[PDB]
Each structure stands twice: as structure tokens, then as C-alpha cells.
Amino acid sequence: NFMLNQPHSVSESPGKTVTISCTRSSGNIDSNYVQWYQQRPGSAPITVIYEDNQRPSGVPDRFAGSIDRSSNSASLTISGLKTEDEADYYCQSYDARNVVFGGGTRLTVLGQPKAAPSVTLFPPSSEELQANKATLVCLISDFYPGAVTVAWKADSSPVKAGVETTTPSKQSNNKYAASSYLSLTPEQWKSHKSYSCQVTHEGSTVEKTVAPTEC
Amino acid sequence: NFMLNQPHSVSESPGKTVTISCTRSSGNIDSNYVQWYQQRPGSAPITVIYEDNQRPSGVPDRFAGSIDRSSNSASLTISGLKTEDEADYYCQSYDARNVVFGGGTRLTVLGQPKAAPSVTLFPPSSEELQANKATLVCLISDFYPGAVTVAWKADSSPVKAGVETTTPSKQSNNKYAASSYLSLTPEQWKSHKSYSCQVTHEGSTVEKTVAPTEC
Numbered sequence: 001n002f003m004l005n006q007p008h009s010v011s012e013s014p015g016k017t018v019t020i021s022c023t024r025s026s027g028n029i030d031s032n033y034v035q036w037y038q039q040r041p042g043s044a045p046i047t048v049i050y051e052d053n054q055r056p057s058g059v060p061d062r063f064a065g066s067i068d069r070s071s072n073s074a075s076l077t078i079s080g081l082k083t084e085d086e087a088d089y090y091c092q093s094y095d096a097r098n099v100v101f102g103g104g105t106r107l108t109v110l111g112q113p114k115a116a117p118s119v120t121l122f123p124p125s126s127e128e129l130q131a132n133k134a135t136l137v138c139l140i141s142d143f144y145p146g147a148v149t150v151a152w153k154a155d156s157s158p159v160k161a162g163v164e165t166t167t168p169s170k171q172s173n174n175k176y177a178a179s180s181y182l183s184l185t186p187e188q189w190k191s192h193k194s195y196s197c198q199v200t201h202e203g204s205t206v207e208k209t210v211a212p213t214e215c
Numbered sequence: 216n217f218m219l220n221q222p223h224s225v226s227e228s229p230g231k232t233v234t235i236s237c238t239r240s241s242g243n244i245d246s247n248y249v250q251w252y253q254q255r256p257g258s259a260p261i262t263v264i265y266e267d268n269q270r271p272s273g274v275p276d277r278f279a280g281s282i283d284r285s286s287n288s289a290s291l292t293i294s295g296l297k298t299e300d301e302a303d304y305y306c307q308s309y310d311a312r313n314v315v316f317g318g319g320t321r322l323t324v325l326g327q328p329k330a331a332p333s334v335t336l337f338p339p340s341s342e343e344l345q346a347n348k349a350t351l352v353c354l355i356s357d358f359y360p361g362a363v364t365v366a367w368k369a370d371s372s373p374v375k376a377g378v379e380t381t382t383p384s385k386q387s388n389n390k391y392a393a394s395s396y397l398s399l400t401p402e403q404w405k406s407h408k409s410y411s412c413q414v415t416h417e418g419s420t421v422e423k424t425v426a427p428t429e430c
């Protein structure tokens with residue numbers, strides 16, 4: 001009944017080499033093969049190492065696996081670190097009455113460059129207006145770090161009701177996305193000259209404006 | 216290179232029984248051992264079943280594995296559901312050397328009433344089209360549990376390229392919201408009769424469609 005012990009967390013800056021260790025609590029590390037998994041936030045894990053040091057196809061050659069018999073440990077070494085490498089890493093081996101996992105190591109890559117959001121404002125769709133709804137959506141994408149402030153306007157005036165903004169989540173380009181949506185009635189949408197979505201990120205503000213359409 | 220097919224999600228109240236299936240696309244389920252892994256939210260994976268029906272020590276007998284040769288499927292049955300059972304469950308097997316994982320099933324132990332999502336599909340805005348962008352947005356709101364699967368189509372064919380979907384987040388009404396966006400060029404948009412957003416929640420699938428128009 002052995003366990004595998006990994007650090008809860010490690011951090012390193014881009015271009016440098018980071019090592020993540022996995023210690024076996026009883027028996028010899030070389031009695032069974034060690035695998036490593038990478039898991040990105042709210043997303044599907046992949047195998048980066050199998051049979052201690054073998055990379056599946058598609059895994060960058062920057063990932064290397066090793067065993068140290070004297071410490072009864074295994075290591076994942078990532079050289080020339082990239083931003084995309086930020087993830088949780090798990091080691092795994094085998095124990096007669098079990099497949100055994102380490103507790104996971106969260107790898108933080110430091111110094112990621114700031115990125116301003118792409119902002120797109122959508123007026124109400126035909127289909128939702130037919131169903132007596134006039135929800136607007138403001139898509140905010142490609143931003144880093146993962147925090148924004150959103151305000152809406154009805155004509156020039158602040159909107160005080162009906163706004164929701166999703167918690168930003170990290171997408172496949174390693175930058176954040178969120179949507180803000182304003183749940184108008186058709187009467188509210190048609191009774192104003194326009195609505196606006198104002199997005200602030202790192203002290204810069206982007207504002208988009210849409211108006212009732214000519215069909 | 217057979218596939219293992221699991222349902223996207225399952226849910227029940229505390230004290231109930233739930234079954235998760237795992238269907239092998241080709242070959243005999245019999246030919247190779249099936250493992251089940253549990254990953255609780257924000258936790259490391261643990262093995263709950265190995266060799267089709269063996270429980271590791273510390274795994275309670277409320278967990279049961281089985282094989283059905285006739286349906287070429289494996290099942291995990293959890294009786295006396297507890298709130299700690301909420302997790303992603305993955306089945307796993309082998310064809311010769313190659314390790315194969317199922318897609319995973321989210322199990323929710325219901326903490327509030329079920330709620331079907333509001334799904335709204337927005338066509339491209341005039342302003343993003345002048346920037347050579349025809350991004351579509353699929354807004355998904357007011358849902359519980361928080362698990363959804365999104366798929367896109369160009370006419371009748373599946374898309375994978377250009378799709379991003381946000382991690383669902385709880386909003387001010389204590390229900391989930393998320394958005395999926397498809398990053399088209401105006402040339403891609405105008406060159407199809409339509410595009411579709413398909414949202415699956417709790418074994419209900421809904422589909423919204425938009426078409427390049429001038430009304």
C-alpha cells in the first residue's frame with residue numbers, strides 16, 4: 001500500500017528548466033513504471049510521459065522523465081519553459097491492489113505578458129426577439145491577466161439592473177475569456193437610441209455601442 | 216485504437232443509486248481490464264475500481280464495477296450517494312500496448328433543483344465584420360447542474376477548429392452561465408447556408424441555427 005508524494009506547487013519564469021519530483025513511500029521506484037499527466041484548468045488530461053521516460057507523439061521534446069533509484073523517486077523535467085506549460089502535473093505508478101496517483105503539482109509560469117481584451121458587442125438576435133427576449137451579449141476574449149470590470153449604458157446613462165458577467169476562464173491560447181449579458185425586454189431595447197458595453201482592463205477602457213437595427 | 220464512450224453527465228439526490236456506462240467501440244470488453252478513476256473538484260484522481268470489479272483498500276463497498284459482454288460495456292454503480300461522491304469519473308482500458316481513456320462523466324449530487332439552459336445564438340455584428348471577423352457567440356444561461364457539452368456545425372458538418380467554450384460559473388441567481396464562440400472569417404461565414412450551436416445538458420440536446428442575411 002505505497003503512496004506517491006509530489007510538491008503542491010512550483011513556479012519558474014519562461015526559458016528556464018523546472019523539475020517536479022514524485023517520491024514512493026515504500027518499495028523500490030524501479031519495481032513499477034511511472035507515468036506523468038498534464039491537466040489544464042477545467043479540461044481533459046493528457047499523458048506527457050509513460051514507462052518512466054517515453055513521450056507520446058505530439059508531446060514536445062522539452063518534457064523529460066527520469067527515475068532516481070537511491071531516493072525511490074521519479075522526476076518530470078520541463079526545459080525552455082513556455083506559458084502554455086502552466087498546468088497541474090500528476091505522477092502515477094502501480095501497487096498490486098491499485099493504480100496509485102501523486103497529489104498533483106500546480107506549475108505557475110511567471111511573467112506572462114499583459115494582453116488587452118478583444119471586445120465584441122452583439123445586439124438582440126431575431127429568434128430571441130420573436131420569443132419576447134432582448135438579451136445583449138458582450139464577448140471579452142484574449143486578455144491577461146484574468147480580471148476585468150464591465151459597465152453598461154442605456155443611451156448615455158448607467159444601467160443598474162439585469163447585468164451578469166461570467167468568471168473569466170483560461171482558453172487554449174492561454175489567455176482569458178468571459179461574456180457579460182444584459183437581459184432586456186424588447187420594450188427596453190426599442191425605447192432607447194443605443195446600449196453600450198464598457199470594459200476596463202489594467203487601467204485601459206474599451207467601449208462598444210449597438211442600436212436597434214433597420215429590419 | 217478503439218474508443219470508450221461514456222455519458223457526459225449523470226445526477227441524483229443523496230441516498231440514491233447511480234450507474235455510469237463505458238462502451239468499447241470495437242473488440243471485446245472482455246479482452247482487457249477496465250479501471251475507473253474518480254477526480255473530485257480541485258482534487259487529484261484516485262482509483263475506485265481496477266480489473267473490472269476490484270476495490271482498492273479504503274474504497275467503500277457502495278462502489279461496484281461490472282462488465283456486460285453482450286453490450287460490450289463496463290459499468291460503475293454507486294449506491295447510498297454521498298455529497299463527497301460528486302466528481303468526474305473516467306473508465307480506462309487497453310488494446311495491446313495502447314492505453315485508452317473514456318471522455319469522462321460528471322456526477323453531480325444535486326444541491327438545488329435541476330434547471331434547463333437558456334440558449335441564444337448571435338450572428339456576426341456589423342462592427343466586427345468591418346474588422347474581418349465573423350465570430351458567432353452561443354450564450355448558455357440559468358442552468359443546473361453546471362455540466363454542458365457544446366458542439367458546432369457548418370451546414371450539417373461538425374466544426375472543431377476555432378471553438379472556445381468558457382468554464383461555467385454561478386451567477387447572481389445561483390444558477391450557471393457560460394458562452395461558446397466560433398472565430399469565423401467573413402469569407403467562411405458567407406460561404407455556408409448556416410451555422411449551428413448544439414448544447415447538451417443532463418441528456419437533453421438543443422440546437423440553435425443562424426444564416427448569413429440582410430434582415
Ligand SMILES: Cc1c(CN2CCOCC2)c(=O)oc2cc(O[C@H](C)c3ccccc3)ccc12
Binds near residue numbers: 037047305314
Ligand atoms: C482523455 C485522456 C487522455 C488522452 N487520450 C484520450 C484517449 O485515450 C488515450 C489517451 C490521457 O492521456 O489521459 C487521461 C487520463 C485520465 O484520467 C486520469 C486518471 C487523470 C489523470 C490526471 C488528472 C485527471 C485524471 C482521463 C482522461 C485522459
